[PDB]
Design a protein around this ligand. Structure first.
Ligand SMILES: O=S(=O)(NC1CCCC1)C1CCOCC1
Length: 182
């Protein structure tokens, strides 16, 4: 409907796949080459389904900060025959607050879904499902089951992936450029 939705659509149409693990279907963001991200609670194994194709996992790393605290981001390298468009230049360098963000989801349950969530707070610490978690962004939208892995964007930036909610607020794990240096 507007330039926020335009940026979000451009990321969904070229940089997302549907990932299936034993713990469900997730929106998965492809970042560059065969490297993608997914919430750590997806419990990625040796094999994953990518758009319903059996795919070997070449590497999977559940990220933690240098306090050895959960970040809820798993970086996956896929044995896929095609590279992602490189979107690393759209990743923020620093922890920050944002205005006017969109949460975008693409699954069998929620195809072509876009939610204007508004203001995003650098929330920081969250007890996420019992797990102490750092680098959490918060938005005041009643997000539901099925939105985990959803991409959070502003006009110009890919800033996080949806990882949970409390019924009134939704929470995303930050994406930072430093996670994807090579
Ligand atoms: O400076 S950024 O936040 N991150 C870049 C990562 C590689 C070089 C800088 C950039 C994000 C997109 O909007 C314009 C600013």
């Amino acid at each position: 409907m507007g330039p926020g939705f335009d940026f979000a659509q451009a990321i969904m149409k070229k940089n997302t796949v549907i990932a299936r693990t034993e713990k469900g279907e997730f929106t998965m963001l492809g970042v560059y080459d065969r490297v993608a991200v997914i919430p750590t609670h997806a419990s990625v194994g040796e094999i994953i389904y990518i758009n319903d194709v059996e795919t070997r996992v070449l590497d999977a790393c559940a990220l933690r900060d240098l306090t050895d605290t959960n970040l809820e981001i798993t970086i996956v390298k896929l044995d896929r025959n095609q590279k992602f468009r490189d979107i690393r230049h759209f990743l923020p360098r620093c922890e920050d607050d944002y205005n006017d963000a969109v949460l975008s989801v693409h699954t069998s349950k929620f195809p072509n879904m876009y939610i204007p969530v508004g203001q995003v707070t650098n929330y920081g610490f969250l007890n996420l499902g019992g797990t102490p978690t750092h680098r959490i962004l918060m938005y005041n939208f009643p997000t539901r089951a099925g939105q985990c892995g959803g991409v959070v964007t502003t006009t110009g930036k890919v800033i996080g992936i949806h990882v949970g909610g409390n019924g009134a607020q939704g929470f995303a794990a930050m994406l930072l450029h430093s996670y994807f240096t090579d």
